[PDB]
Amino acid sequence: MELTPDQQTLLHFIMDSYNKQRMPQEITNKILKEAFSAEENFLILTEMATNHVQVLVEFTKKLPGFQTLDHEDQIALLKGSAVEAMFLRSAEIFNKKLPSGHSDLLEARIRNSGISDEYITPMFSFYKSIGELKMTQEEYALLTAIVILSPDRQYIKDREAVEKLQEPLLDVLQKLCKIHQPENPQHFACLLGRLTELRTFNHHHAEMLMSWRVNDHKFTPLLCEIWDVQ
Amino acid sequence: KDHQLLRYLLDKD
Numbered sequence: 001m002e003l004t005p006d007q008q009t010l011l012h013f014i015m016d017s018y019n020k021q022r023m024p025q026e027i028t029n030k031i032l033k034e035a036f037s038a039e040e041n042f043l044i045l046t047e048m049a050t051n052h053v054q055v056l057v058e059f060t061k062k063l064p065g066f067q068t069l070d071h072e073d074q075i076a077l078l079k080g081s082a083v084e085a086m087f088l089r090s091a092e093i094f095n096k097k098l099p100s101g102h103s104d105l106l107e108a109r110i111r112n113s114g115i116s117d118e119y120i121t122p123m124f125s126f127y128k129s130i131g132e133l134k135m136t137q138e139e140y141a142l143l144t145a146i147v148i149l150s151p152d153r154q155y156i157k158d159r160e161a162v163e164k165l166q167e168p169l170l171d172v173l174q175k176l177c178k179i180h181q182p183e184n185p186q187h188f189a190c191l192l193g194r195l196t197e198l199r200t201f202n203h204h205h206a207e208m209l210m211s212w213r214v215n216d217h218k219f220t221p222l223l224c225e226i227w228d229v230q
Numbered sequence: 231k232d233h234q235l236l237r238y239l240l241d242k243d
């Protein structure tokens with residue numbers, strides 16, 4: 001029931017790789033510091049989102065077995081998860097404990113960042129649904145890896161190969177859940193339940209960037225490739 | 231091609 005030695009090695013390795021990410025405080029200190037125009041915020045979004053993809057590619061290449069997968073399946077997994085991984089990381093940063101009234105301010109800042117009204121509620125409803133589960137850093141790290149190695153994506157040719165890589169991560173995560181929350185025997189299942197709501201953010205990701213309240217929507221070549229914009 | 235940059239980041243190193 002307790003993490004095996006193989007599971008403890010897997011977990012610590014996923015944690016190290018996950019830890020190579022931009023410090024949350026860097027992101028929130030800036031948003032809180034002062035109010036920016038919808039234009040300055042659109043630019044902050046594109047630079048953060050370009051850096052997020054670059055780090056995600058490095059995190060993914062380190063996942064045990066990912067490099068043994070067919071090359072075309074490797075691109076399909078990365079392309080299929082990149083936007084979901086971005087919102088999951090945004091949800092993590094959003095629910096990090098801040099000084100009194102700071103998350104209120106962070107929330108007011110994001111609300112008036114330039115994003116369209118139609119996307120506000122679903123986004124904050126998702127970030128809130130995430131904050132309700134009170135996830136640990138190990139849970140965020142494992143859930144990101146599970147999101148990336150989803151064998152039920154589109155354009156995946158060899159699904160059973162992906163399943164084989166995702167299963168040990170699900171098993172470690174399940175054990176952590178049955179420890180971090182013995183009183184919530186539904187914790188593992190709700191974490192998996194959130195993954196379904198996250199897929200809904202895929203439906204309109206391109207439109208979320210396009211409807212931002214700016215006169216022009218300039219993106220980087222890499223973002224154009226990942227999000228489905230030009 | 232279609233995911234030229236993504237293919238590069240994955241195939242470098």
Ligand SMILES: O=C(O)c1ccc(NC(=O)[C@H](C2CCCCC2)n2c(-c3ccc(Cl)cc3)nc3cc(F)c(F)cc32)c(F)c1
Nearest residue numbers: 022027028041044045048049052089090093094110113208
């Ligand atoms: O690499 C990383 O570790 C990383 C972390 C966070 C982000 N995300 C962002 O920068 C944007 C800002 C970007 C500047 C404007 C405010 C939102 N962001 C979004 C959002 C809103 C809309 C869309 Cl379409 C995507 C994301 N939700 C947020 C909730 C927050 F608590 C927060 F702090 C930032 C948040 C990221 F890109 C990368």
